[PDB]
Amino acid sequence: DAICIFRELQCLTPRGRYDIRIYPTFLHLHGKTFDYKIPYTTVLRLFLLPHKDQRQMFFVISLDPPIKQGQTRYHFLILLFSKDEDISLTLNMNEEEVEKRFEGRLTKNMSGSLYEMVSRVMKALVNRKITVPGNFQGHSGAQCITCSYKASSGLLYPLERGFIYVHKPPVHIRFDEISFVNFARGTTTTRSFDFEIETKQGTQYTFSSIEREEYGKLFDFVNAKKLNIKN
Ligand SMILES: [Cl-]
Numbered sequence: 001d002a003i004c005i006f007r008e009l010q011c012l013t014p015r016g017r018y019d020i021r022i023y024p025t026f027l028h029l030h031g032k033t034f035d036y037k038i039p040y041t042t043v044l045r046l047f048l049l050p051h052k053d054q055r056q057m058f059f060v061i062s063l064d065p066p067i068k069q070g071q072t073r074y075h076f077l078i079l080l081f082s083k084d085e086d087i088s089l090t091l092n093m094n095e096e097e098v099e100k101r102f103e104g105r106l107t108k109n110m111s112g113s114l115y116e117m118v119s120r121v122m123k124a125l126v127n128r129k130i131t132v133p134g135n136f137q138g139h140s141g142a143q144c145i146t147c148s149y150k151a152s153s154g155l156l157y158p159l160e161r162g163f164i165y166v167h168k169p170p171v172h173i174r175f176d177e178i179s180f181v182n183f184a185r186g187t188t189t190t191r192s193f194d195f196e197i198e199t200k201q202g203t204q205y206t207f208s209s210i211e212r213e214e215y216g217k218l219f220d221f222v223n224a225k226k227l228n229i230k231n
Pocket of ligand 1: 188189190191193211
């Protein structure tokens, strides 16, 4: 029986509504049609990312190996939360257990926003810090840039030492993986900028349809971070 269960979470990747059942060594993502049992040892990284609208949060779980849904491979689990939603949790464990098990990181009875509770429980169980944005300031106080990638609109987050784009497909690129970056501008009167990244392995990523105001914030970031610009 589970330590706790988070019900009816909005998953973006893979898309659907899933319960997350929390066990000592794995989580169970349980939906109507599919389910996946995911050992914590397969979780590489955790991210908590504020949507630019200030009303939603992404929770991103990086996986290796990926989960398989037919021929589709998902290297990330992405959950989407309203900042508003609240939850009360009662861990299916006695009080003294939890203190020993989690080094005092959790208590038996907990209350808070759903996104914070999921992040806290995941943090404790995987024994990993949550990756958040650093000090990047975008346009109008957003910590991300709105852009298109592979013909889908999404959000690019400049992190302390990397970039992550959500959600279709998600992309995480560490600074140490980057060969160079470049900027290009088209002739449209809006959404005219492209930001391109080439990795050391030769892979290329283009984030396009970037507004000029956001391009300017991204430009300062890339320079502040001393990334190599190739014109
Ligand atoms: Cl523009």
